Amino acid sequence: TIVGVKFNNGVVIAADTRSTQGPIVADKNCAKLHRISPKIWCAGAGTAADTEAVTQLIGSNIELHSLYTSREPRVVSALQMLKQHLFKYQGHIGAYLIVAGVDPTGSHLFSIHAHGSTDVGYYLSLGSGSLAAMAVLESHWKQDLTKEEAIKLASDAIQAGIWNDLGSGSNVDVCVMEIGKDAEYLRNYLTPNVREEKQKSYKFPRGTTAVLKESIVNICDIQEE
Template sequence: MFAMMLHTACNSYQGNIGAALVLGGVDPSGAHLFTIHPHGSTDKLPYVTMGSGSLAAMAVFESGWHANMERDEALSLVVAAVSAGIFNDLGSGSNVDACVITASRTEYLRNFVKPNERATKERTYGFRRGTTAWTKEKVRNLVVEETVTPVPAPAQGEAMDIS
């Protein structure tokens, strides 16, 4: 059985850092795969996804995973799952990294597949320093005039049916 690390994502909110982690490994009792959520909970499952593209990736795993997969079959499934995340979520990057962990070794497959290979630009664009105008002037009092018009209360009528 292969443990596959699918996705690690870090997000910054209000100065705090959170990490959604997938942790895989092998010990004397076998292969294990865990998720560690930013809020601290953990799960131990046969396949896991985390991050912004995880829903698309999970759909692929749910339809294609089965116990005791061969290495090539498992890697193909991981490529399909991560690619689904990439193509269905703008925050999921552009390449597939994989890590195959067995009892005897760990194999890092960096840039294993690049489904969104960056194309060469048709032209180069260079802008002379100072091309973009800017100002040190602060903009204040954007609202020049404001009028508040109260909305009259609705007339008493039949109550809404909430049954």
């Protein structure tokens, strides 16, 4: 579950922290929030390797472009470069991204689908939990939201995904990008799913395991003398 919510003086994006292989939870605290540039972040859904690779490549080219032009990078640039790359590979690179950021032009919120299509909105959601998240956004979103209101709305939309979507879970990661300010990355903004103490300590008595052989491993280089 990834959402983006535009507000009065900026844009906020949030995501859940679960990655799944089939029905198994691979990572309980995944990071789906990616720095393309200092004030341009995006949230990714779909193939985990694809979203990381595509944000790192464009983030690299955006940094070289920024240095070449002597200008802070623009969201429309990262957007354009991402969609032309994804379109080239005809959806075989399964990267579904919500791209937000503030630049000299103002605050921007876009979404990018793996076939190379983009769209503009005040509120967006993507992934398996998008329908749970969009249901909350369509119920509580208004024009002229404050910063506090937009964080509340964004995290609530992720909670909807965590609770009602099997593909989403664990914690809520938020990133606030306000005009004329530093982007604040709030890693584990909420911790709604903390495991309880086990009934038993499964620490074994020493010598429990049968050992055939033991040996010192040489990790040091060839020695002197």
